[PDB]
């Protein structure tokens, strides 16, 4: 059984874009590392969130705010001792420029040919991130850095390091400097998982909080 959801934000760019309408395959068992997962937001389960399951139960996960890379050690209730091969391709320009605005503290995303410049805005960087045996793209913002003082600090771990409790997950957005995720709010209980996002049903050209120009039928199909 499939459940459709609309994508209002850029947190999962470039993989999912604002105005995408996705289909979720409801989960039993269990997300694989790197799965795109819809889940009930722990602190407000009236809200559905969509993120990538980067950390599974037992993983020691560490995030470097400067290089903006993950380190993952599985089977590590304490505290372990076994590295997942996590590798990154070289940074390259992405298809998007992010431009900030006022009246509505906000930002807009614009797909800009890589041979072009947008007058106002900052071009996001792109890399591929491989977590063991699965690979996806991530966008970073060169002038942005995570303020570790705002991080969720797990009891008894140092900052920017987490050990995923049994029965729980660590979620991260692909638009890494524009995603409020487990780094800020902690783990996602297994019960809170709705399902895996497997396809784009429909897509509309749109910005956050407005209507759409037109469509993106090229996007209908599996999620890559």
């Amino acid at each position: 059984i499939y459940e459709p959801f609309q994508i209002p934000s850029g947190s999962m760019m470039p993989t999912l874009l604002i105005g995408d309408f996705i289909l979720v395959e409801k989960f039993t068992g269990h997300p694989k590392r790197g799965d795109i997962v819809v889940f009930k937001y722990p602190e407000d389960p009236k809200l559905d969130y969509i993120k990538r399951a980067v950390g599974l139960p037992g993983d020691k996960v560490t995030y470097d705010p400067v290089s903006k890379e993950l380190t993952i050690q599985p089977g590590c209730s304490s505290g372990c001792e076994n590295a997942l091969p996590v590798t990154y391709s070289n940074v390259e320009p992405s298809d998007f420029v992010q431009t900030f605005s006022r009246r509505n503290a906000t930002s807009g995303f614009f797909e800009v040919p890589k041979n072009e410049t947008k007058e106002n805005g900052i071009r996001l960087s792109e890399r591929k991130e491989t977590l063991g045996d699965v690979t996806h793209r991530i966008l970073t913002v060169p002038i942005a850095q995570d303020q570790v003082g705002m991080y969720y600090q797990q009891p008894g771990q140092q900052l920017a390091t987490w050990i995923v409790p049994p029965g729980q997950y660590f979620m991260m957005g692909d638009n890494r400097d524009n995603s409020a995720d487990s780094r800020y709010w902690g783990f996602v209980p297994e019960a809170n998982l709705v399902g895996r996002a497997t396809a784009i049903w429909m897509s509309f050209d749109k910005q956050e909080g407005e209507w759409p120009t037109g469509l993106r039928l090229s996007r209908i199909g599996g999620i890559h």
Binding site: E3, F5, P8, I22, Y41, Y49, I50
Partner: peptide
């Protein structure tokens, strides 16, 4: 369905 996912 047809709700948002943040």
């Amino acid at each position: 369905x047809x709700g948002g996912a943040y």
